Structures are given as C-alpha cells and as structure tokens.
Amino acid sequence: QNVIDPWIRNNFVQAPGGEFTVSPRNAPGEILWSAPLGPDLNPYLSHLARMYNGYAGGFEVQVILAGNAFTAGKIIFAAVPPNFPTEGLSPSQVTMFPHIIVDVRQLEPVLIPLPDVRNNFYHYNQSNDPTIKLIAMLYTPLRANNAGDDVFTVSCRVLTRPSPDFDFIFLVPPTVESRTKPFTVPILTVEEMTNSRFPIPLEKLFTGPSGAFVVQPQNGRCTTDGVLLGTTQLSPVNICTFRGDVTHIAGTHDYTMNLASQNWNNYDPTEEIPAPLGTPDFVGKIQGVLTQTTRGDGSTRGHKATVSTGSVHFTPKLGSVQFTTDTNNDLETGQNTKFTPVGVVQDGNSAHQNEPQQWVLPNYSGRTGHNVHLAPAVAPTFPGEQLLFFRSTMPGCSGYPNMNLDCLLPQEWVLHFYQEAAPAQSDVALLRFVNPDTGRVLFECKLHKSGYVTVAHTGPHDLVIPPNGYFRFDSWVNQFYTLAPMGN
Amino acid sequence: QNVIDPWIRNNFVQAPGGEFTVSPRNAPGEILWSAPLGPDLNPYLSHLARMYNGYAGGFEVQVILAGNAFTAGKIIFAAVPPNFPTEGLSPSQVTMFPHIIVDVRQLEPVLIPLPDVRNNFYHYNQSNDPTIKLIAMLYTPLRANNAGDDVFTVSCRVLTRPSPDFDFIFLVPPTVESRTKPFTVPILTVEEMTNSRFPIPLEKLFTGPSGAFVVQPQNGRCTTDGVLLGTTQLSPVNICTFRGDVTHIAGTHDYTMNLASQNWNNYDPTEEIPAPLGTPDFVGKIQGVLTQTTRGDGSTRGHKATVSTGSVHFTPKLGSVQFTTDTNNDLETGQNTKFTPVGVVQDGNSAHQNEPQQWVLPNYSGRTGHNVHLAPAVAPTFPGEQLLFFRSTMPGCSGYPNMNLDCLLPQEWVLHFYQEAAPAQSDVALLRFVNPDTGRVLFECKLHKSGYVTVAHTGPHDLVIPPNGYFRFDSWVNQFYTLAPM
Amino acid sequence: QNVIDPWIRNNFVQAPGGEFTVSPRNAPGEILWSAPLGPDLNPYLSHLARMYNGYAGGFEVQVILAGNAFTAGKIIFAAVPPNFPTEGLSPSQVTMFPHIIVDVRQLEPVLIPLPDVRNNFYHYNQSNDPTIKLIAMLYTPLRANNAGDDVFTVSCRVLTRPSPDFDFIFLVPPTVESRTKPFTVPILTVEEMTNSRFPIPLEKLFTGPSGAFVVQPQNGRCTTDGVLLGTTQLSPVNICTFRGDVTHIAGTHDYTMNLASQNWNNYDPTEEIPAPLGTPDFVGKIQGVLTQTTRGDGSTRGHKATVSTGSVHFTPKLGSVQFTTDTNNDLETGQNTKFTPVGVVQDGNSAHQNEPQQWVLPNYSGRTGHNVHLAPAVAPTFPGEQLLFFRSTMPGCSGYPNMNLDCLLPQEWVLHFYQEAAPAQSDVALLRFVNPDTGRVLFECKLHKSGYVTVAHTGPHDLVIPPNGYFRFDSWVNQFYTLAPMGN
Amino acid sequence: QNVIDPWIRNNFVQAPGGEFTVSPRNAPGEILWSAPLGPDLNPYLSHLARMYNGYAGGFEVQVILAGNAFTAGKIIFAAVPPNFPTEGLSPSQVTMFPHIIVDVRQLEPVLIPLPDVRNNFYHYNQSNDPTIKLIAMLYTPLRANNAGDDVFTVSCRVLTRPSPDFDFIFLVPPTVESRTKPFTVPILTVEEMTNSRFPIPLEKLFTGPSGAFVVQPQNGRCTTDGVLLGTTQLSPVNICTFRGDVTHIAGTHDYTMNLASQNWNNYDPTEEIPAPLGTPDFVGKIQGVLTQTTRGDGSTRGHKATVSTGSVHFTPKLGSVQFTTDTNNDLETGQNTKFTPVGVVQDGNSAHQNEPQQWVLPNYSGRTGHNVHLAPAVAPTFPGEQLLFFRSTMPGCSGYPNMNLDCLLPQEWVLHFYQEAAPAQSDVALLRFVNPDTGRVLFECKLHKSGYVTVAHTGPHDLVIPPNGYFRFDSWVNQFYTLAPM
C-alpha cells in the first residue's frame, strides 16, 4: 500500500526509449518498436523504482505521429502476452491481439491500455520475469516517394502514464550496486579527450568508407556493459610502454628486451589475452627514449631507440622484442628498463606516407602460429551509414610518416564505461551531439553495444563542430532505427 | 499537495552526515555538529526532493549518545534563527538561544523537534535561502576517570524523521543542472590510477610530517565540487609537455621557445592562470625529446633535450622558455615543435637525491616579478593528523635523482570531480579504505573539500595495501571530527 | 480587492510580444519562444498595470499556427517553475513539465493554463522576482523542403487572457519615471532625418555585404536603453565642430589649434571617452570655414580652411589639431576660434573616389599609443541578413571625393532613445516599415539592442520606398526569429 | 507575547529627524519631509529591536504645527507604496495617493495611521526590505506678514508611536551581529585629532568656496559604513612612507627605489588601487630621512633625501620612485629600506606657495596612460553649502611652502569608521558641534555618506571654537533637510 504523486496519474510524459522512425525502406511484417512493461518506461516511475522493490500494475500508452499529407499507410500497435514468441508474426495475425491501428496522417494522439497479466502477486525489479510486451509494426506498405526527396522519414513518439491500480511494495535504499543505474555518457568536450591507442590528444572527428580495408583494432575496445575486450588498459600512460629486462646483442646495436609486466612481475603466457597489455596495434617503426634506472647509483641516461612492429623479431606474445639504438655498449643487462614512446617514423626508402598502416595487425607471435583471441571485427550493417572515427595526428621525427590516426573510443569513454558498469537495455543507444551555447542538436549518431559509433553519411568527410560541443545520451533503440541525415 | 510514503513518517533513519565524535582532544566551545534544516537530513527525503521544487515543514531528530560509564561531559543542542550568523558564536551566547543540555552517559535517545520558522509560504529547493540551523556544541570537555591507558572516544549518532506537516509543492524532472548527483568516489583501485604531477603510474601511499617544508603543488589541485585550481588540467598526457615555436641562439646549443596555446593558438599572458596549463611545478632538470614535423616533406625530427626549470630564463608565464640540447642545428624556426618528457636528471656534483626538490615551486616569471595566482597552501588543522600522499617513482636518466614523487590526488579523481559537479554539504567527507573480498576496513581518512586527504598517524610510515582495496564514501563530517587510529 | 472589465475575462487578445516563426534551419532542442508571466503580455492588462502596483494571478494562453498541409512536425509548449534552469533542456525532458503538443497542420487553436505559483502574497511591478516562464520549442525535426521553395516559414501567434482569480492590489498614479513605459520609435519620415556623423540630411537606405571591411563607427551609436556609447552628442550642429585656441606656425600657412570644450571650458584628458565629443569618424580631408570673433571689435573675417584626419598632426585626444589655410598672417592668437564644416575634398594626386574611407578610424592619439575605449564592433550574426545603413551624400568642393556616407542611426533616433530611456525587454526588437497611405507593410527589420538595424537580403541594393513611409515598433523577439524576406 | 512596556504603547516620542520648516520662499511641489517606516522612527523601539529578530506592524504618526490665526497655506501628507520612486512627483500627482490636507492655522495635532503593507508574514532586520514611505509636501503656499527683517517661518515636528499590532517575533543575543549597530562619532577634541594626509596634528577648521578647483583627495576617504576608498589606510605612521629596495644611479646622486608591501612582501601592479597604500596624493617636493637596515659593516645609516612628486620618473603604481640625496654612493642593493618624511620644501625657480598644490594629484603611472580607480570627486550641491576642511600647518625646511594642508576626514575618524561598520540608514547624518563647558551648540554640519562635511556659510571663514568642543551624532536624515545659518 503506497501512493504516488497525483499529477503523474493525470498527465502523459514521454517514455525514455519511446522514439522510433518509419521510412519507405521498411517493409510490412518487420518489427519496428518493442518495449517490456516496466517502471523504466516512465521517467518519474523509473526514478521511483530505484526507491522501491516491486511494481504491480498496468499502464496507459499514447501514440503521436508526425506525417505529411502525402504519405499513406497504417501502423499497428499490439500487446503480446507474457510468454509468446514474436518471431514470424505476420501483419494479419497480430491483429488478433488487443491492438490499435493508427494512420500516418493522424494529427491527434491515439490511446491504448496495457493491463498487466501475471501469475505472481507482483514482480521483482532485479529479475527478468517475462511480462506483457508492447510491439509496434507496419501494417500496410508505406508510399512517400512522391513527397519531397531523399527518403521521407516519418517520426513517432510514445507517451505513457500509470494505471490507477499501479502501486509499489517494498521500500529500499537507493544503492550504487542496484544494477538499475541509467546509462550515461561523459560530458567532456572532444578536444580534451585522450587517444586510446597512443598517448596523444584528440583533434577531430572523421567519417568515411570502410569497405576498402578491414577494421579490427585491439585498443580502445570496451562494450557498454563495462567489459574490456581485446588488449585495453585503463591508464592512458601505459598505452605503448614496455618494461622488463634487456640484453645486448654483440656485433651490432640491436638489443633484445624481455617484457616482465606492468607491475614488474613475472609474465604469464597462459593468459587468454592476445598480447601483453599495452602493446602497439599498428605496423610501423616507433621512435622513443629508453631509460635505465640503476637502483644503487641511479644511472638514468636516456637513449634514443626504435622498435619496428611487424618484423620477424617482434614477438610480444612470446615475451621478446627487438630494439634498435645508436650506442651498443652503454647499457647494463643486470637492471630492468622501460621504453617511453615519442612518435613514429617512416622508412625513406619506401613510398611517402606508407609506413603506418593502422588497420593492419602485426603478427604478435612471429612465425610460430597466427594471432589468437582477437577482438571481433567492426563493420556497419544498416546500409547508408559509416563508422565515426576519433582522428588525431602523432608527432614525427624522421622520414614522412602517415600523420593520421583513428580510434573508435576515447580513453575517457572507456574508463567511464568500465567504472559505471551500467547494464544495456538494447544493442544500440542513440547519441546526439549538442551545442551547449544554444541547446540545438547538430547531428545524431548510434552507439552500438559492441563499442563503436556510426553516423549516416557517405564519402570521406571532416566534421565541423564548435570547440565546446559534447555528446549526450537519450535512449535505446533497435537496429531498425532510420538515422537522420548528418548534413554537416 | 503530494504524499510521502507512510513508512518514512513513522520510522527513524540515519542522515548521511549524521555521526560525530567527542574526544578528549576536543577543546570546549568547538562546533561539534552543524546542520541546516531541509531534505538533506533524511536520505529518503534527500532522494525524493530531486523530483520536487519546494518544501515546507519541520523535523524530529533523535540523538544517540551511548557512551561508556566512565566518561563525563555535557553537550548542548541549540536552534539558530534563519538569518543569524554563527561564525563566532560562544557557549554562553549559545545558551541564550533555546537550549537543551545532555550528558555523555545518557542512555535514552535525546528527542528534539525542529519547527520551520520562515516568513513565506515555502522555500525553493534550487535556492540557498537561510533557514533554521541546528548546532551541537561541546559544552564541557570530556574526561575519563578509568584506570588504565585508554582513550574513550564517544561516537554519537543522529537520526531524523519528517514532521506530519512536511510536504512538497511543485514537480520537476531530475535533470543534470540541479542540486543533484550525490557525491561519490571512483571505485578504481590504487594501481591503475595515474599521477597528476607527471605521467607515471602510482605504486604506493605514504603519510608523514609536513612542518619542515611548504606543501603547495600547483598540478592535480581540484575542490570536491568540481573547480580546478592552479595549473591542473584534465588530460593525463599534457602534464609536463610544451608546444610552440623554436629559435636557435647563435654560438650555443641552447634554443629559445615561444609557447603556443593548448592546441595550436598563441598563449595569452593576461589569463588568470599562473602558467600555461601543463607546466611543471618543481625545480629541477627535466629530460625529454623535441619533435618537429617538416611540412616540406613530412619528415619527423626528434632530438634529446633538457630543460632547467630552476634557470632564470625559465619563464612560462611570459611565454618564453629556454631548452638545452646537444645538437645546435637540424631544427627549423618556422614550424611547430612539441616537447615530450621522459624522466628527470640531476648533477652528480650536487647532493644526491636533493636536486628535484619536489616541494619547491619554480618561479614562473624569472627573476623579475613573482608568482601571483597560486593555489592555497595545504597544512593539517587538527592535532595528530598528517597528510596522505600518493607516491610514485619518476624515472631517471643520469646520476642518482630523487625519484620519489608525491601527488595529492590522482588524475582519475580530478577527472571524475570535474566531470561530475557534485555539491558538498559540509567541509569533510569520510573515506574508508575497504577490502572487497574481506569486508574489513584498513584505515579511515578524511577528504577535505579543498582537495587533499588527512589521516591520524605520527611519523613516517609506508602504507600496506591489499591489491583490491578501494576508497568508499560514508558520511559528511566537519573539521573537528576525530579519526580512529590505524 | 478590485475588478477589471468583464469583456477581458471572456475574450482572447494577442500578446504584444507573442509572435514567432519556425523554419527548417531550426533543429530540435533549440528554444524558440520564451515569456515571463506578467501583466505586460496582455495589452489591456499591460495598460492597467501602469495604474496599479501588484498583480496576483494566472493566465490562459491560446496558440494559433499557420502551416500548409505539406509541412510536418510538432511544437511543444511548457511551463517552467519560478527558479529552474532552462539551459540544456532536451525535448524529451521538457515533457515532464505541464505541456501541450501542437501539430503544425492544426487549424484550430490550442489552450493551456498558467496557474501562478509563488511563495509571496503578490508580486511587485518594479521588481525582477522570478515567476513561471512559458517556453515553446521544437519537438520533432521540421521537414518542408518539398513545399514551394526558398525556406518555407511557418508562423505562430499567441493570445492570452487573465484567469478568474487575477486581481491587482494597490492604486498609484501613472508617472513618467515609472520605468514601465513601452518602447517606441519616432514616426518621422526618413527624408527629414539628420545624419548622425555629419550635418547633412538623409536621402536613402542601403543594404549590402559587410564582410569585406570592418564596421565600427564611433558616431551615431546609442543603445535602446538610452545609454550613449562611443563619442555621440545630442545636438546635430556640433557634429564636427572644433572650438578653442589657435596658434600660427611661422614659415608656412599651417595653424595649430588646441581644443578647449564645447562650452569653452577647460579640456579634461582624464575622461574615458576615446576622443573629444564631436570629432570626425573618418579618414579624409575636410574643407570648411574658420571664423574668429574678437570680443572687443568683432573682427569676424572667415577664412577657408582644411583639416586632414589620419595624418601625424591630427591628435584630437591630446588636444592639438592642424589646420591648412591660404592666409598665414590674418589671424590673432589671443582670441578663441571655431571651425564650421562645409564638405570633404579628395587629393587629386591619388585615385578617384578614394580619400573618404568612412569605416577606417583615424589614429586619435597620433603615434603615442593606440586608440582606447572604442565602441564595440557591429556585425550580423544570423546567416542570411545584412546591416541596413542610412545613406546620404556630402557636398564637394575640390577633387573627386567619395560622395557615399552611411550612418547606423539617424540623429533623431539617438535623441529619442536618450530622452525616452525605455527599458528593453529583450535584445532584438522587430520594426516594420509602414506606408501610411494604405497601411500595408513593406518590409521587416530587426533592431538590435546594441544600436543597429538588420534586414534579410543578399547583395548590394538600394531600397525603393515611398517618400512618406515611417518606421513602427511592434514587439520584442529573440535571436531565433526567422526574418521574412525583404523583396524590395 | 513579547510585550513592550505600556509607556511606549501609550505615549508619543519624537522621530530622530522629524522636524522641518515651511518658509514663504518655498514654492509648491517641493518635498518638505520624507521618511521610511520602521523601528528606526522610535529610538526606544530602535534600541529594543536590537535584541529581537523580526517585526511586523504599523505606526501612528502625530504632526505638530506651530502657527497662528493670521496665516494661510496648506500642507499635504501622503503614504507612498513601498516600491515607487518619489523623485519628480508633480504636486497634482501626490493627491492621488491616500492623502490628508492640514492647514498651518491648526492648533491641535494631526493623527495619521500608517499600516504596514507587505507581501510576506514579517520582515527581517538584516533583510533591509523596502517599506512604506511618508512624505510631506507644500501644497498651498504660505502667505503671512514679515516682522521687519525676519521672515515668518512655520515649524513642524513629527512624533511616532507603535500601533497595537506592532510586535516582535524571536529573541536573539544583543551584541553578536553588527548589522543593527548604531552609528557613533568619536568624541575626541579638535586639537587632539591627527591629519590624515600627513603625520601632523590638526590645527583648526576652515570653510570657503571650492568652485575654482577640483577637490579630489585620495587619503582619508572612507564611507560612513566602513568601506575604504582610494589609497586611504589605517596606520597614521605610514601616510607618506616608502618601503622597498634601493639601487644607485651611476653618474649622479640619485637612487631608484622599488616598492614593496607594508609587510616587505611583493607588490602586484594589477591591483585595482591607484597607488600603493601610503603614496602621497599631492604634487610637491618632499624632504625626509632615508634609513637602511644593512648587514656587514653595520646597520647605522640615514641621510637627508628628497622626493619629487612631479617628476616623470615618479611611478608609484609601477613600483619605481626616484630619490635625491647628498652622498655620491653609500647605499647598496639587496637590503630593506624605508623612507620617513619630515617636511615639504620648495623650488627656487617657481612661485611662492605654488609647488605644494594639495588639490593636484600627481600622475601615479608617470606618462604611460592615466590614473585609474580614483576616489570620487567631492563638491557641494545645495545652495549656500561649503565644505569644512580640517586645516593644519606644514613645516618647511627651505623656501616658503604653502603650509595650509586640508583634510576632509581626520585619521582617527576613518579608523573609527573602519572599526565600527555601522550601516547608514539614510543619505546624510546631522552633526552639531557642542561645547560641554556651557552645553551650547556652536554650529550644525552635515556628514555625507561619501565621507565629507558641509556647513551653511558663504565666503572664507576660519572657525573659532573652544578647545573642549567636540562633535556629537544626532540622527540620520535625507538631503531634503536644511541647516540654519551659522
């Protein structure tokens, strides 16, 4: 026995994840929108549910469309019982459920009740018990090609309010570990982020085709659930830093370095990670400073050094890496050393701007086997959109190296995702870039659960954005969302 | 006219910052506890007010003072008018107000009503209009008449419940830009957090005396409510790096560098910042690599270099610095150049492990002028309390440099504080280091809102830490809170 | 306890500042219209409020749109509580307030109540106490490109009426200093105005690009609040008149004149004004008549004289100016003199029509320092509009001087703004040019608070207007107003 | 309930400044009297309210007119709502307010209720909320015969008492909050106070016209509520001193001195003060003694030194002054140095009593720009009002300096105003000079909030006063009030 604010029961508010779009590309029978019946579909009820433990009641749902007077077609909303398969439901059969048919040209909203049916007294918030699922799908083919141009997108909005019999059961403190925390995105500006695959600051955003080359980086990969994938660290200082023992090679200036750990501990080759944490993810020659710190005397004399990834002597998985330097005598093998990255360089004997091939993965285990336990590849699926890369440039020292560098997620985003561990309600979350000076939205992008960002645009392009813009999270949408044109 | 859950109105719960302590170290007349009336006195109300815009009504507060039978003392509770300042209030002037005096040995809880005294219908949640304030003061010093070498610190609890006439007025969504986002600390363990004064991962914690030197670092300073001070900046990489234009000085290997802005622009000398963001704040010689990109052919040139922060020419504020290298050529004067530090070096002729001088601030304007806009100095304010430093080992390249480096706050903590502008309800936040696999508490530390951490210990001591330990926030306490010894 | 006319409570009238427009350029999340709850949003109530001191009640607001049947989208109106930030409000969150969603294709009006919430008994008219703010913003993206051409602008209109509980408190006389006087614009015709930067009558209006040169005049600058900026006087006779002592330079015809004041008082170089009041604002050679009036004998013999602004001998700030004349002996240094402007002349040794460069500001302090305390620069911000200049021509005497002259505001407008001192309710006021013969409006222009006029047009153009047209003030609008095309 | 003494509730007392006069020279429309409503109108209530927190209730005002049956003329009393400007009110408009018309022929007093109008339950003492005003204006001019050379002027007095609804709210300790602290002027005699612009004891008082020059002093400027203006300080021994480092100028007998703070710390030129505290604010030639605290051979130093306030090198704002001495080279750089003034001298190539022009401010910035953040200029505005200067004689070592130095406020007065930050209840305070030997009043003067004193006199005149006379504070009034001729 409990009561909520009387205003909530007498007004309609937008459901956090209740936005969807229809385009002529969508055919009848495809599922457009789906939502379980829970307190999370009403912002006030979602906020209150963090204070209580059990909901018990139905809803009233209101649908608003936005269509021009040229477009024609019908959209059917229906309620599906607690344990009923929804795969293969033809548009004819779905009418047998309680349903409403809404014309696209309908100015007014349409109402529908959602009475809760169950065999239990009440549900639990930290449980997955099936409930009535509200679905919305196309009824007749949509025809809007005549109107305007491009692909006329008709928008939808879903509002909800609680039924008079809705009530909560038990009162509990709102705790951090509740597993009900809403998903959020850091409000940091794009220019202050840190590149996840090299210690350099971000500068811009990029869009372009990805069909000409395979995208599968092992750095900057982290799902929205806070699970780290591939070979990703938290600290942006140990991105490409090696620490361990060093041995001189007589007759030349090359050195062989055996990696120990990030904490100067014994290396574990039995781990399922593809390569030791903090290894480079690109084929190229990297120039930096190697520093040896003798414990007794502090003989800290730095030396210029280079490492050429992708060569036959680069086997980080086995625990051996080759360094090329200028002095072959001024190093003592009895003390551990570390390597600090500085930049990349290009072999002048090859074509200009060719040495750094970010996409190509170097052979971590040399000639003894092919790399294993790699992060899954990333590629867009919905036609008409391209990946969004966070683009920066590393400094150069010699040759003409390729300045371009792209990372899927900034280091701050990875850190925040790891810290939050917020459960994902779907596979795709919708993010809008917002200018805080006026509040206008510049463009929309979809953040997939696998840890990448997609935006609807064709051809290479450099996004033009104000220096103070930031990303904001709005809702969870399914893969059928027709993303609005970017246009910047 | 909204309704609260009837369970809240009939039961007592503990306020977030609702515990204090009485210790023999406390002098008489000190403000032991202070709290303004409002939703913050009850966690349920402090969470429900996020959805509302106003409130009106009083409270009922119980105080639990279950002290030992061998102690003696008197504590006074008084109510302060809305507009009445309490900066220099004394016990007699406290007794002028409506007062209740209770023993430290009291067994029954002390019950106090707090009616809301106001000149309007209701208060605004987003505003800061003063209201009735409750203060608990140590009327009589605590003394113990027990045999044995023991200290009977008395821990006292405060519970609150809303009065029957408490109600909210208007309903608003719980957006970001509001009195929301209760304060929290990242759950990251010590190992992954990176240093704020230099790009080096942490390895240990330390506590020790600080009376022999002035502790006033400029990097890694941030108040707990999301304000950056001095030269603290978000990016863990741009911590001690420089970028700008380089010019060769004829007859010597030294180079004169004109500083650029953060990304590409020119530095503004009129900014209310002591130095360009990411300027080192310790006197010593820093070794690094100068990198230049030539637009003529795309070639990248990298050369070893050393910068003397203690030199006269080291004037980041004026926009001109001096670099020392070994090659006096192979550098163009019309291209942007970056400086990436690698480590710290020292002169072997000088005293070993005494040149870095981690607690000495180099002059940002050279001989002429002085440092102007600095962060406030940090020093403990309670007897028996020492600062807590996050210690890392900055690498060296020659000789025996003092590799021991200390930072007040890790870069992750300042990044989190800036990202989440959580308001502070008091001056001190209690943080307990806990072991998740065991459930015990290793030690208790106070996090001052100015951005530093204090503990109760005497003499130098290297902290012992489980690998999985992390900091957990518990309550809000004032400056006069006494900590349980390690 | 008081009563108002029963007709007001039973009818809707237009709110003085209640007009706004929506265009496809506007994106969701941007604030379109905002209005505090006060008596000033109802003309009858605004008139009555000048007679009373305290309002106390709510309103009923009605919204009318004007959209074709091709346009599609939604607009949301909401009420914001007395002390709630409105920055960053996403379109999803704003629905949590009391709200109404209006479709652009809605023929009928939509109603919404505005009940007043407050902690005081009643508000004060001469106070800034926060109240409920009504906001109106886009809900879904607007799509009208298919319909017609250009950028289809959909118009809006807001009507208001008082709630049954609205009542006034105290009765006071309507005084001039009330600080509640409505803003007004002089009804004088364009052809009888006086140029604010030279004593010549106005002749026409001009529009054109301003990106090729910097616009920052120091004359004719006066904000709508009656605060004088830069170096502006009230009397149009002392626009470029110098008065003070004169000293002959031996060996040539040049004279050095020390300015005293406009009232023949001691000069004050410690003033924060950039230059003495009434100095020229352009680089050029000015020809006029210098007259000396001896007190005892009235030796009033005029002499032709020229002054070359921008030269090294032109330092009005220090208090010294150089005059070039034809007679180097017929002047007595013991008597003060004045200079009367006549026209401008051009050096024939240079290119034709080049000497007068109105935009360029001469160095007021010669070589000793750069000019200080300048008026802020003026430049349009909303893309698609250009500044409106009041254009005239000065007479010429020698050479081929540039006849064109532009002033931002006429002298009569500056005088009226200084006299009225009417407070501004926003940063932009909307002015329509009206032909009084028939009452039709010719074009619309926006008068910014900084003291300049902007009109939507591209390319250089000379406006064609009837000789008897005059400007009229209608309302205050925000910077998001989409100005209608000028087209004349 | 918070009962007030019945004698207060059943008797009338005079308002602090509720007396005015109506003369035949007055024309219709002039505001004769104006006063806000509040506890201040009754001294008993104004002192009793210091122990309470809030008040609520109206007043009853009695008007007493001194006239006979051979005069004509009418006065109008009106009650202005709280937030309504009264400047520029036409004589016709005032009748639209609730008004009462009184004849100067009346003998009985006039009773006027004055209820409190507000939008909240009650007012706070520290809120300073606007309240209902009461204004008395001349409606119909005064027509009466004159007794020879004396013009017949009617007098009027105003008395107030609390309404039965007047009551206080909550009780607070009397002496912790300074917001309600009454204003008070020191009672030291004239011969004992100290001049503020130079460490010299005061000599006498001077009056005279000031329209021939700009009176803009920079020392001794302080508002009556305890706010310092310009470069005025507290210590009277640092009025014209310089502290800092010294460096000899080769080829001459001159020294460039770099200023330091009064604590021998660094001085920041960015401060929004016209000059470092203790900088002289008058053009002239100052002779003094220069003493340095030197190490090594000895600290015994000191020589006659001269400072040119009019020199182009005199840049106290930038931190550099020029000193002229008689020794070629005897000081060294790197030791703390102070300059002690002893007098003012003259140049033999200028007019007598022309160098120490006390009303001409030296250019604090030298020649690079103009002085900034100056103290507001002071000049009388009402007819027949002249400034009252505290005049002292300046000793001279050579030449014939203009020994007359004038100060608007002595150093003790500014020190007292800074110490006791008593808020001002109106725009001017009425001060009369009282001789305690006989109890008579020599003259009455107005003390403006800006920190200056005005008297009603015409032409130069040196005041003759008994040694024991001193100033006494009477009441706060507004500018409308007039003073009888001295």
Numbering used by the authors:
A (entry chain A), C (entry chain A): 45 to 532
B (entry chain B): 1045 to 1530
D (entry chain C): 2045 to 2530
Paper quotes:
The quality of the 3.8 Å cryo-EM map allowed the unambiguous fitting of all the three quasi-equivalent VP1 subunits in the T = 3 icosahedral capsid, which showed well-defined densities for their S and P domains. This is also evident in the cut-away view of the cryo-EM map, which shows continuous density between the S domain and the P domain. The conformations of the A and B subunits are the same as in the X-ray structure, whereas the C subunit is ‘locked’ into a singular conformation selected from one of the 15 conformations observed in the crystal structure to adhere to the icosahedrally symmetric organization. In both the crystal and solution, the capsid protein VP1 assumes a resting state stabilized by an elaborate network of NTA linking the capsid subunits and the interactions between the S and P domains, as expected in a T = 3 icosahedral capsid. A novel finding is the metal ion binding at the dimeric interface of the P domain that further stabilizes the resting conformation. Although the metal ion observed in our crystal structure is likely Cd2+, based on the composition of the crystallization buffer, the nature of the metal ion in the cryo-EM density is uncertain.
All these structures showed that the capsid exhibits T = 3 icosahedral symmetry, with a diameter of ~400 Å, composed of 90 dimers of the capsid protein VP1 that consists of an internal N-terminal arm (NTA) and two distinct domains separated by a flexible hinge.
